[PDB]
Subunit: 210 residues, 4 copies
């Protein structure tokens, strides 16, 4: 139990990294998914004898709905496993004792927001690709693989790099929104990044000043 919470935090990080990635990119390893589901089942079993009634009124419903496999496009239902983040949200008391832990958690949240926005950006680009104006076509032209098209690794790296540059307000000019949906998404990302800097990069300075 002493190291169970940090293992669950790592598990939540893994699923937060690889669930939106699998939804956006790979939908078009399984054994690791089965292993992590088994570990979360073990966790919920441990969570349970006069206190089980308290758990039932508490977070039992959310953990149960996030732990039940949905196998019977059914692949979009796997998003429900993103509900495991409530475990980290509710156990913040233990995850706020060390300064290095707080720094690592802040970078984890920053990288996760960038990753989720990258998945959304690729979703938009791939939705609009079939119907020379989108960012995917320009990327393929500028990396020497005209639309075939860029490999999945190239698309993910470009999406993450664009999202990081927009969040950090560098705006490299390599990747620029050109369609109305891309422009509106970029406006939303600019607003999100403004709020995220005002919070996170003030907190980081304040707790480095410690």
């Amino acid at each position: 139990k002493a190291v169970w919470d940090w293992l669950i935090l790592l598990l939540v990080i893994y699923t937060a990294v690889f669930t939106p990635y699998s939804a956006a990119f790979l939908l078009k390893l399984a054994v690791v998914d089965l292993i992590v589901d088994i570990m979360f089942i073990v966790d919920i079993l441990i969570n349970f004898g006069r206190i089980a009634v308290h758990y039932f009124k508490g977070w039992f419903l959310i953990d149960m709905v996030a732990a039940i496999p949905f196998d019977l496009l059914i692949g979009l239902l796997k998003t429900a496993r993103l509900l495991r983040l409530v475990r980290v949200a509710r156990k913040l008391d233990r995850y706020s004792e060390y300064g290095a832990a707080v720094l690592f958690l802040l970078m984890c949240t920053f990288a996760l927001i960038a990753h989720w926005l990258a998945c959304i950006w690729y979703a938009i680009g791939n939705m609009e690709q079939p119907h020379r104006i989108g960012w995917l076509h320009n990327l393929g032209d500028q990396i020497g693989k005209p639309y075939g098209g860029p490999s999945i690794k190239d698309k993910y790296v470009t999406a993450l790099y664009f999202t990081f540059s927009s969040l950090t307000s560098v705006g490299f000019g390599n990747v620029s929104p050109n369609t109305n949906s891309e422009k509106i998404f970029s406006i939303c990302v600019m607003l999100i990044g403004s709020l995220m800097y005002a919070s996170i990069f003030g907190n980081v300075s304040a707790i480095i000043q410690r």
Copy 2:
């Protein structure tokens, strides 16, 4: 009356959004504008026998100027409705108790400043267009609609996206000033955005701690 105050704030936000838009874009529904005008007349009616003399020498002239209809250019004279913003600026104390409502108001005023600057940017672009130089011609080339050029949706979205990038200091490089009026406007927006952005988001970071 508190519900009435919040309703008046909502209508003031609506007019601050839709009268500069109509002045900049739509010149060359209205029933909602008429309804809002009737609601504002209702507000100036409920505003009022002992206190009537007190208010008559107060803001009443300002409210009257922003309430009279100029339906005898009429379109540019209809911009007098922007004076209703004092109806919100004069009782901001009623909008400073929730704490998070102040954050919402700061986000709203940042978005409103961006929208007004977008309308000014489009006004400059349209006043220069008839005379490959200019943001409208470049936008028409990029978007795939060479100059009748881009639709009003594309023009407004591009203007708002450019203004947001300039205020947030991203500088995407998709749209960039190229004419002397555009360059001077961009210098003014750079100064104004630095000053505002710094003030607004310093306040936002301050209220995040609470």
Copy 3:
């Protein structure tokens, strides 16, 4: 003498604005500059028997060397008039009483640094006359006036706009250094702008609350 300090401040701002501009751009009105020099001579005269030795011991040398006419590329010596800028520094005792005055003065210093860096940037870009390389040739190509070349208005506005984009860290994309001297100057501008952003726009965030 009650309002003489503010008038002298306006004259100092004028000379700071217009001496580097004449040194860089116009070298290739006189009456206003002559009137300003006469007014500065009047200023040193009026503020001059027990206290004469006090002035002789103090700022007499700097005030004198910044007031003697240089008439006899000899106009390059007129840049010594920038030593009059120390008068606002030594009268910051009174110029700092009002918060609005402090904010206006901070914006003035920011704009003056941008203007001086614009003059230096144009000077650097104009040293490369003997040599599609350099910001002046790119500027001429962009605005449809290939080298003739752009007018002095276009050159000054473009230099000021590039300097403002660099200092604020927007980097619009039209103007970008392409020569080792330009790149090194841009690195220096980035260092100076980081130093001033840490100073000017932290002090502004402190001042606004005050």
Copy 4:
């Protein structure tokens, strides 16, 4: 004694500047670094009979490994002289006594981080070059030196300018990543730049008001 270790700080800055530059750009004079290592041998002799065992227990081995000559990948082993900054890290009491000294040291470490990132960026670009995609090819085609190729001066200046623009979040658009390795390096540099820029310049803004 203070003059001695301030000279040692200057020597440490010299070697931190000139070790990665020689390791990366000149992999294809020795009197200065011979003098520097002789001076550091003199320093290790000064550092040492009662206290000799005290130093032997402590920093003796760290200072010895960074001072032993490596003459006998063979030329790459000289990067071990980059453990010498522990000399200035271990004695921050003197170096941080003055506020102006801390300001100068913060500027120096920011410039050093930019220099190291420039060396890494050039190493990546050079390892990718012999395989219009790389940044070196674009630099050569934009500077007027088609790939021969740009001189070492041009390559170093361009790398340093790109690194400074990325750290300061300008993103000029002249140099932008176009390969997966370059994009990953840029993402990591954006995270690093956010952290170091925020920490360093929060410290700077704390210092200036003092």
